[PDB]
Nucleic acid binder design. Structure first.
Ligand SMILES: C/C(=C\[C@H](C)CCCCC(=O)O)[C@@H]1O[C@@H]2C=C[C@@H]1OC(=O)\C=C/C=C\C=C\[C@H]1O[C@@H]3C[C@H]1O[C@@H](/C=C/C[C@H]1O[C@H](C[C@H](O)[C@H]1C)[C@@H](O)[C@@H](O)/C=C/CC/C=C/C2)[C@@H]3C
Ligand SMILES: [Zn+2]
Ligand SMILES: [Zn+2]
Lengths: 293, 1099, 178, 116, 95, 152
DNA sequence: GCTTGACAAAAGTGTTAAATTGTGCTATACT
């Protein structure tokens, strides 16, 4: 075992001296922001108090060194300076963690990367996106397999930049500023415009949790009255969707490639059999069973 | 029943409730009355109980009294706490954002032993929050509730766990005190490697006494021979270095180490609950320590009886931590008490140390006393504490259940994942104490539960249940409340057993409950106590589900949870087929107006109702009108009485939000059809008659509170004004002089409510922006526009405005000159997508709403209002919905049982003078005593008008419906009836979100989620998996680059869409750039390398 | 673990494979599941009827008709291509993998079968009562079994012996050896 | 004084209270680029370029140097007179005239919607 | 660029940390309690990390994009976009 | 494994896994299970060395180097968690689990990530090397036929 | 077409007073 580490340093040009720091890097201020909320009160990242303990103790150390000091005093400082950097990097990894008011432990540099709330799982392998929406779903029994009911309000916002250009292309609005206000206040002229932009422009429908890739499927949007979403009754199996009040998310593919992939790969009617057993999924169920039986 | 104004609701119960439902809010009140110890509580303990009642305040005051330092030269004694009259009224507090509190004063005695003087000074501790009549508190203007906690009572508990290594039995013991280090058998304060014998030498007992007291114990003698410790002071050293490693000991420290850790009262606190538990089971001293070891020895030997010098014989058996005998509830009064103790112990530190550095004889109770930590404890408890919660009021029921809720979470108990699943399992001792049926569906299952109906809390924190003791096969009228411990001692007869004349056991054998519990029989000779009535185990919400016995616990738990999720309607019609609790629970909720003195009505107005008592006294009641509730539901009340009416003490003067004529109405009665209909109601979806819209039967009101403040800015002062830097004179059309929306106006998303402006700093306008300023001559204004506007997707009418100004005195935090609150309300019609449900756990969204013209409709021409699918009914194991669907039709059209000859056989054991009821009469079927299947059928055939004399429903509960579209009858008979369905707080208007572009997070550039921020959806790990499974790279990349994190890319794509150009190529996700930076800050050198191109820079 | 697995090429050309039972002894009877084992596969070597008939050539999709045909000739086993034996340098090959359950045809070259496999295994896990998720995780994690059971170390007859509270099994080799 | 004594708060606190989120991620970025504005601002920049085309070579030349459209650096009446070789007053005059020309409804009608 | 071949890590030497750094932060000071502006030589110091406002030095002697990438001889702040405040790192020299 | 050999272990593991899912009435084609099993046997233990004893090295990576013109091992069975952590991509192992552990060993070994795996490309915003992201597909060039341009 | 002188507001500079900010210090004895 001890040879593994010793060997690692040989092949690499890394000097093992790197494991001791003569200098500590300080993160950019916008990543450790301090800002005032609405009302004027302030809030700031924990890193600043952690950086504050380190720079405090390091400076106090310089002070004691210059005067000259009994080792007991100077050694006590170095031990403190050692702990302060440890907390900055990984807080609580050794001994009790540095805490603020209410006895809650401060957030170290390591606490940014690790966990479901860290950068990877939170801001990296997933994230919130533009051109998306959600609502509760209602049955689509009159819909074609490739279609979905889309609340007109929802659709207007999703496509807002598109309809803004269409109604400026037409004389409806003279400039983009007027086009924006024309959509915001929902002048009745936009609706006939919205139906054009939405035409043959697909959208992705997701319901969490997403178990198999069938949990996301494209559909052709159809403007619907009401604030709910009309879902085709045959896709409930794939989505595991109950109408007990579940909700679903809508995403708008933008680039040509994205729309191509929507229509071709993820289109609702192209995915029928489950890609595990090969058995049919969209196959009728419940009422349709007893209805045919 | 036995309520003066109670409406007439006929019951099928075959029993007679021997005991009225106790006051449901007592648990919250008595606890607080004990804490403050008012005279209403004093009389309680004095009549039957202790002769020295101690209020919670005094109890914690006795602990501090007196204060003395190491020298004992000066002492400070506390006594006689006092409360003044409340500062302001609850209605005033909720208006002004203050807390409802009575100031507290104390007697502070300061005695100097050397000078022998006395300085007596009246001390002001602080404003002490007071509990309302409803059992709530007003904390900073919002109404809150303090939930009672479940904790393991301090005591000695043993457990036997088999070790796989030896595959043999092992016994471990634990003693958990009120405070101080805990010991386990030695294992003390997380220090293992201990010879339980060595500590008996730490006290100084000689080895001779070990062979004397141990006696028959084999390992008792064998371990002392194994231990190499020689001497009493040398064992205290072997115990010293492991407990205090790194500190060289001393004969003075080593000996007081053991005494100060436990025997000393300061660091080891004897618990009244702990002191009582073990004192019978066997503050601390030796007698308790040696008793535990002797108890453990006999438990591993297998003897069931243990006795030692000068002690009472008790059984040696393992204990159950989940048995309610060893598990107690911490009531609000106690949860408050503990937080006061914490405040005094922190002040005691400042009192003691202040004496030393303060000039002697120049110090007074006021100088030594500093109440900063004392009030901080109270203020810090009512806010931010897990047990102090925003009261949940959707409806009177939701609130009444919040109080009475008991939980195992929060400080002082197992928290979240730590708790094992064994605790969640319902114990046999939960009967009549904690309702098994009502709990959360999610990760909290079994950790949260509601107190049962007749359950009652003990002054020691153990729940008691009412029982009727039986002697010699005769059940007396004696009712005795028994704790879980004493219940297992006796045998519990079943609530429903055949009753004999003046009373006696008629049945040959009687149902019984054992200490197992175990269910067995006898001849009725050996029974001691019997149940007070059915539904002892049930809670208030659970007892409100008609036909509870028929529905599976799964769907029932869903049924209770969804009653508390209902919303008050405008009409608020009561249930047609109910249970007993409907009326009793509405009055105990506090949302109904009750009259406290017999008298007559002087006046009745929408504003207030006044009554002239027989006493000549005059009471009056101001009616809550359209008061926005905590969650937005409407609190409006309406008077149910007329001018000349007589009334009686405890009657109902006016209805609350969800109540009608005194009983809870959580929904409406609707005509139901169980046929599947054209695929529109499918997979739990529902369809409605458009009548429910036109007639506002499911309509409900919702109210929002918007708030904006004008503060002092370092660059100036914020000013609320009608002047906005750039706006049309039209956008201000609805604003008044001050700049606030005019009352009664309509507001649309993005509309201005309160115009506000804040100073600006050096502007440096763009050259293109300055040229237009000169051309059109609009002078660039000195102040930016920060103005309150209505949130996205929200609209309504302006109800009222509340303005707090600095000019006007009022009060505001430092820096805040003016604060205005605008209240908007809206009438929400029942809409497709809204969530409805019945009491049985059946839930579903509205899938479609059809014109009354084309609907399944009876031969009358009467369209059914709702159509429920047939498929989800049978599999979910809730058949109550069908029953109440039949009975719902019974009560609607009336009925007459045949008087021809005698009474039919189905009525043999059955209803008393229920043989006839008019049309629309209301029914009540108590949960386990309710109507029975036989009696249903007999009623199914019954009185048959509509107007003309034809029957509209057969004895199977079916009818022939005509399709309203084609106009032809449906081939088969369809079940129709009336079912009670509730509107639920999940609404489409609130749940529908859409985003194109919007705000972005500061550190990370991603869009910030939630509707408040106008944010976007989260495309997560699992979703990216599905995207990858499909093999779409461009769709995936697009979502994670130009749709969220790409600062230059998201602005280009927008530019591209507006110009109809091609969407550009994505950039580098800002989050990743942040990653390299956070890795560099760790002293990790992360270099992005080209193929042959070495290092790359991100800039 | 599987997310980097994707079809990189049409055919790796190896002759290796695995033997599917496909039926036993009847009548004297398709194997209980040939739908999840034999079907959707691709023949590694020609399926030879008794004597020389060769009822199905190597590289056949093995649909429902091919199984009935094969059964007629009385073949009680078949050697098939599998990703276990696939020799592809990177990823796997379409031929070894076999038909795409979603498409009904030979897998496309872009397909990422690792993720599709992971999801296909996990998604039903919600229906696994827990002989359950604990046993499955035990297998994929390769941990020593909960209650370990012995396997024969070599061929030969067995001598069983009972010491109460225990068992003794001795295998007398056919060598006969130790 | 009581405003000075206020102490800041942690962006890393969890106020979700079974919201899982932390305060810090609820903070908007007010200096973030707004796509619709920057696009419209680019469209405004084009519309001005056109309106100036109607003006004389020196009329527009003075307007551009006066507000610093090309350089982003405005210039004083005297400095513009130094390039065109006149007195600052003469430039003051040419200013007033081209502005009443811009105020002419033909050129102004199109830029009205850009007020803000 | 969006296309890079390799991404590599390694122990950061004190020299690397110093090369990254645009200056040493010598004080545990966030911002002034009155003006609420960044304190010099402390955390947030504009002299080291970067300007608060685009093309604006601390004192303001050079407020214009006319000269980018010049440092103000008084406050010592560089004139450039405030985006650099998010890209730049300091360092601390331990005793 | 040590008794019947690597190719037999896979047959076993697939049978066992397929039995649990068969008890609950779940139909999963064996190939899916096989894709996962394949990843457990992909490495072998190095008994003698360029290589160190006890280390788990990729099978293919072990064959070409060991030859070295003119070092023995045994097949290794390892669980999915342990197998995935051995992946050649350090930032893919980091985001998976035991981040601090992974980063400390990657910085000492001075590891270089070629960004071949698809998770790596997701983090940095590249096109995953699968589906439409593969070279042959994304490099497709499209032009109308000369015969079609004539028809205009 | 454009310039000249008178002129006042606006913008910089230099000079001073007021304020804000940093640091030293406090001797019964107290570990
Ligand atoms: C999880 C929890 C409280 C959650 C906030 C709510 C409980 C969720 C369970 C569920 O509703 O299914 C625990 O609460 C206490 C201590 C530890 C835990 O705190 C936790 O783990 C987390 C938070 C604990 C207290 C938070 C207080 C403040 O957070 C907000 C404002 C303050 O009070 C909160 C209001 C809670 C009232 C809830 O009441 C319920 C319905 C809604 O969930 C809420 C209206 C009603 O059904 C009511 O009957 C249920 C009360 C829960 C009884 C639990 C007591 C133990 C609101 C969320
Ligand atoms: Zn292959
Ligand atoms: Zn400067």
């Amino acid at each position: 075992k001890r040879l593994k580490v010793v060997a690692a340093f040989q092949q690499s040009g890394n000097s093992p001296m790197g494991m001791v720091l003569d200098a500590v890097p300080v993160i950019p201020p916008e990543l450790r922001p301090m800002v005032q909320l609405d009302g004027g009160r302030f809030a700031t990242s924990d890193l600043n108090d952690l950086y504050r303990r380190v720079i405090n103790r390091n400076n106090r150390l310089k002070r004691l060194i210059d005067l000259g000091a009994p080792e007991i005093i100077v050694n006590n400082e170095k031990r403190m300076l050692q702990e302060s950097v440890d907390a900055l990097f990984d807080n609580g990894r050794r001994g009790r963690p540095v805490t603020g008011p209410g006895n809650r432990p401060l957030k170290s540099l390591s606490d940014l990367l690790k966990g479901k709330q860290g950068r990877f799982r939170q801001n990296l392998l997933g994230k919130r996106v533009d051109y998306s929406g959600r609502s509760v779903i209602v049955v689509g029994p009159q819909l074609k397999l490739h279609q979905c009911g889309l609340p007109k309000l929802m659709a207007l916002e999703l496509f807002k930049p598109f309809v803004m250009k269409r109604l400026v292309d037409l004389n409806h609005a003279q400039n983009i500023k007027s086009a924006k206000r024309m959509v915001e206040r929902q002048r009745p002229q936009v609706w006939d415009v919205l139906e054009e932009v939405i035409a043959e422009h697909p959208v992705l429908l997701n319901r969490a949790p997403t178990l198999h890739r069938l949990g996301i499927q494209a559909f052709e949007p159809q403007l619907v009255e009401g604030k709910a979403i009309q879902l085709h009754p045959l896709v409930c199996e794939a989505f595991n969707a109950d109408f007990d009040g579940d909700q679903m998310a809508v995403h708008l593919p933008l680039s040509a490639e994205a729309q191509a992939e929507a229509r071709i790969l993820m289109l609702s009617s192209n995915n029928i059999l489950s890609p595990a057993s090969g058995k049919p999924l969209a196959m009728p169920r419940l009422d349709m069973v007893t209805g045919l039986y | 029943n036995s309520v003066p104004g109670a409406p007439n609701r006929v019951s099928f119960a075959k029993l007679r409730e021997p005991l009225e439902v106790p006051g449901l809010l007592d648990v919250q009140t008595d606890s607080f009355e004990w804490l403050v110890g008012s005279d209403r509580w004093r009389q309680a303990a004095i009549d039957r109980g202790e002769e020295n009642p101690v209020g919670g305040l005094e109890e914690v005051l006795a602990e501090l009294s007196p204060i003395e330092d190491f020298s004992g030269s000066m002492s400070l004694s506390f006594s006689d706490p006092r409360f003044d009259e409340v500062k302001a009224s609850v209605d005033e507090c909720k208006d002004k954002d203050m807390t409802y509190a009575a100031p507290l004063f104390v007697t502070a005695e300061f005695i100097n032993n050397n000078t022998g003087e006395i300085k007596s000074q009246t001390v002001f501790m602080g404003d002490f929050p007071m509990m309302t009549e409803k059992g709530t508190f007003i904390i900073n203007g919002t109404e809150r509730v303090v939930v009672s906690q479940l904790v393991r009572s301090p005591g000695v508990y043993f457990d036997e766990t088999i070790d796989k290594s030896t595959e043999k039995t092992l016994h471990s013991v634990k003693v958990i005190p009120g405070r101080g280090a805990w010991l386990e058998f030695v294992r003390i304060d997380r220090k293992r490697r201990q010879p339980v014998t060595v500590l008996l030498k730490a006290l100084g007992w000689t080895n001779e006494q070990i062979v004397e007291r141990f006696g028959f114990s084999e390992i008792m003698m064998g371990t002392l021979e194994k231990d190499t410790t020689s001497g009493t002071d040398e064992a205290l050293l072997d115990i010293y270095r492991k407990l205090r490693p790194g500190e060289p000991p001393t004969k003075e420290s080593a000996q007081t180490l053991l005494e100060n850790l436990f025997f000393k009262e300061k660091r080891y606190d004897l618990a009244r609950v702990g002191r009582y538990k073990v004192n019978k089971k066997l503050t601390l001293t030796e007698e308790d320590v040696v008793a535990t070891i002797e108890y453990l020895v006999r438990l591993h030997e297998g003897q069931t009886s243990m006795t030692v010098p000068g002690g009472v014989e008790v059984p040696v058996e393992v204990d159950d931590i989940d048995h309610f005998g060893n598990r107690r509830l911490r009531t609000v009064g106690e949860l408050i008490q503990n937080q006061i103790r914490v405040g005094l112990s922190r002040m005691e530190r400042v009192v003691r140390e202040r004496m030393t550095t303060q000039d002697v004889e120049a110090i007074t109770p006021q100088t030594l006393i500093n109440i900063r930590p004392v009030v901080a404890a109270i203020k810090e408890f009512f806010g931010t504490s897990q047990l102090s919660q925003f009261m949940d009021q959707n409806n009177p029921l939701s609130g009444l259940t919040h109080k009475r809720r008991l939980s195992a979470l929060g400080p002082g108990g197992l928290s979240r994942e730590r708790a094992g699943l064994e605790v969640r399992d319902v114990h046999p001792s939960h009967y009549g104490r904690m309702c098994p049926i009502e709990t959360p569906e999610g990760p909290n299952i079994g950790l949260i539960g509601s107190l049962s109906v007749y359950a009652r809390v003990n002054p020691f924190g153990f729940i008691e249940t009412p029982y009727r003791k039986v002697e010699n096969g005769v059940v007396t009228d004696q009712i005795d409340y028994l704790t879980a411990d004493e219940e297992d001692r006796h045998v519990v007869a079943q609530a429903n057993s055949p009753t004999d004349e003046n009373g006696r056991f008629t049945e040959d054998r009687v149902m019984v409950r054992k200490k197992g519990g175990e269910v067995e029989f006898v001849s009725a000779d050996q029974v001691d106590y019997m149940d007070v009535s059915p539904r002892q185990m049930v809670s208030v919400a659970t007892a409100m589900i008609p036909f509870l016995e028929h529905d599976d616990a799964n769907r029932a738990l869903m049924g209770a949870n969804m009653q508390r999720q209902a919303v008050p309607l405008v009409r608020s019609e009561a249930p047609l087929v109910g249970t007993g609790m409907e009326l009793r629970a509405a009055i105990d909720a506090g949302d109904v107006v009750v009259a406290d003195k017999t008298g007559v009505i002087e006046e009745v107005s929408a504003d207030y109702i006044t009554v002239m008592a027989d006493d000549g006294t005059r009471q009056s009641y101001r009616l809550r009108k359209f008061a926005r509730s905590n969650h937005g539901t409407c609190a409006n009340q309406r008077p149910i009485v007329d001018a000349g009416q007589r009334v009686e003490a405890g009657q109902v003067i006016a209805d609350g939000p969800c109540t009608q004529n005194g009983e809870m109405a959580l929904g409406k009665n609707l005509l139901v059809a169980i046929m599947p209909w054209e695929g529109h109601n499918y997979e739990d979806a529902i369809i409605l008659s458009n009548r429910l819209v036109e007639e506002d039967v499911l309509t409900s009101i919702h109210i929002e509170e918007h708030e904006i403040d004008a503060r002092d800015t370092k660059l100036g002062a914020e000013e609320i004004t009608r002047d906005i830097p750039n706006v049309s004179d039209e956008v201000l059309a609805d604003l008044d002089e001050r700049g606030i929306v005019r009352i009664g106006a309509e507001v649309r998303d993005g509309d201005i409510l309160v115009g506000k402006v804040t100073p600006k700093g050096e502007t440096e306008l763009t050259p293109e922006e300055r040229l237009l300023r000169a051309i059109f001559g609009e002078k660039a204004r000195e102040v930016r526009d920060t103005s309150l506007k209505v949130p996205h997707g929200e609209s309504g009418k302006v109800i009222g405005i509340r303005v707090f100004s600095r000019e006007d005195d009022d009060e505001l935090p430092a820096g805040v000159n003016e604060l205005v609150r605008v209240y908007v309300a809206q009438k929400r019609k029942i809409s497709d997508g809204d969530k409805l449900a019945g009491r049985h756990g059946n839930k579903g969204v509205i899938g479609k709403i059809l014109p009354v013209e084309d609907m399944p409709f009876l031969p009358d021409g009467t369209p059914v209002d709702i159509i429920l699918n047939t498929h989800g009914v049978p599999r979910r194991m809730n058949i109550g919905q069908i029953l109440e669907t039949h009975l719902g039709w019974v009560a609607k059209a009336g009925w007459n049982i045949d008087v021809a000859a005698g009474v039919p056989d189905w009525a043999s054991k059955l209803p008393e003078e229920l043989y006839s009821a008019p049309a629309d009469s209301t029914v009540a079927t108590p949960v386990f005593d309710g109507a029975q299947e036989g009696e249903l059928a007999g009623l199914l055939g019954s009185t048959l008008p509509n107007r003309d004399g034809e029957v509209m429903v057969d004895a199977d509960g079916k009818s022939t419906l005509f399709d309203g579209r084609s106009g032809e009858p449906f081939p088969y008979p369809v079940t129709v009836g009336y079912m009670y369905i509730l509107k639920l707080h999940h609404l489409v208007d609130d749940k529908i979100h859409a985003r194109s572009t919007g705000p972005y997070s500061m550190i990370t550039q991603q869009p910030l989620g939630g509707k408040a921020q106008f944010g976007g959806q989260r495309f997560g790990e699992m979703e990216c998996w599905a995207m990858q499974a499909y093999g779409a790279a461009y769709t995936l990349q697009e979502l994670l680059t130009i749709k969220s994190d790409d600062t230059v890319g998201r602005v280009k794509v927008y530019e591209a869409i507006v110009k109809g150009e091609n969407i550009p190529e994505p950039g580098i996700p800002e989050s990743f750039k942040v990653l390299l930076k956070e890795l560099q800050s760790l002293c990790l050198n992360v270099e992005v390398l080209s193929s042959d191109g070495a290092a790359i820079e991100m800039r | 673990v599987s997310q980097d697995v994707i079809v990189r090429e049409h055919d790796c050309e190896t002759e290796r494979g695995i033997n599917v039972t496909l039926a036993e002894r009847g009548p004297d009877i398709r194997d209980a599941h040939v739908e999840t084992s034999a079907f959707a596969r691709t023949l590694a070597t020609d399926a030879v009827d008794a004597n020389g008939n060769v009822i199905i050539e190597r590289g056949h999709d093995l649909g429902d008709p091919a199984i009935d045909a094969l059964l007629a000739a009385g073949i009680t086993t078949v050697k098939v291509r599998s990703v276990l034996t696939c020799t592809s340098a990177t990823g796997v090959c379409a031929m070894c993998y076999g038909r795409s359950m979603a498409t009904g045809k030979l897998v496309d070259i872009g397909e990422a079968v690792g993720i599709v496999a992971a999801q296909s295994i996990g998604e039903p896990g919600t229906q696994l009562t827990m002989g359950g998720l604990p046993r499955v995780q035990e297998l994929f994690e390769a941990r020593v079994p909960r209650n370990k059971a012995p396997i024969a170390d070599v061929a030969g007859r067995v001598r069983l012996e009972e010491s109460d509270k225990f068992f003794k099994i001795t295998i007398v080799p056919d060598d006969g050896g130790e | 004084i009581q405003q000075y004594a206020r102490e800041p708060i942690s962006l890393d606190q969890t106020i979700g209270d079974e919201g899982d989120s932390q305060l810090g991620d609820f903070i908007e970025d007010s200096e973030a680029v707004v796509a619709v504005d920057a696009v419209s601002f680019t469209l405004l920049q084009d519309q001005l370029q056109s309106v100036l085309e109607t003006l004389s070579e020196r009329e527009a030349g003075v307007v551009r140097l006066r507000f610093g459209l090309t350089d982003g650096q405005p210039r004083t009446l005297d400095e513009i007179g130094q390039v065109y070789g006149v007195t600052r007053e003469r430039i003051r005059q040419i200013e007033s005239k081209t502005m009443s020309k811009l105020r002419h409804p033909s050129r102004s009608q199109v830029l009205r919607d850009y007020l803000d | 660029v969006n296309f890079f071949d390799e991404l590599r890590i390694g122990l950061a030497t004190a020299d690397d940390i110093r090369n990254w750094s645009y200056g040493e932060v010598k004080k545990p000071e966030t911002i002034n309690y009155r003006t609420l502006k960044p304190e010099k030589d402390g955390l947030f110091c504009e002299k080291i990390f970067g300007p608060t406002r685009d093309w604006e030095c601390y004192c303001g002697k050079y407020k214009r994009v006319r000269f980018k990438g010049i440092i103000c001889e008084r406050c010592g702040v560089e004139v450039t976009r405030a985006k650099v405040r998010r890209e730049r790192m300091g360092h601390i020299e331990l005793a | 494994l040590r008794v019947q050999g690597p190719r037999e272990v896979q047959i076993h593991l697939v049978k066992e896994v397929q039995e649990v899912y068969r008890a609950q009435g779940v139909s999963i084609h064996d190939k899916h299970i096989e894709v996962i099993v394949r990843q457990m046997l992909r490495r072998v233990t190095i008994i003698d060395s360029e290589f160190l004893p006890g280390s788990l090295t990729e099978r293919a990576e072990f064959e070409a180097e060991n030859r070295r013109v003119v070092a023995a091992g045994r097949p290794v069975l390892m669980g999915i968690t342990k197998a995935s952590l051995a992946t050649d991509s350090w930032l893919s192992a980091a985001s998976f689990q035991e981040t601090t552990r992974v980063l400390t060993d990657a910085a000492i070994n001075c590891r270089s990530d070629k960004l071949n795996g698809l998770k790596e490309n997701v983090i940095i915003g590249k096109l995953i090397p699968a589906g439409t992201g593969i070279s042959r597909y994304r490099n497709i060039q499209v032009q109308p036929t000369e015969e079609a341009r004539a028809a205009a």
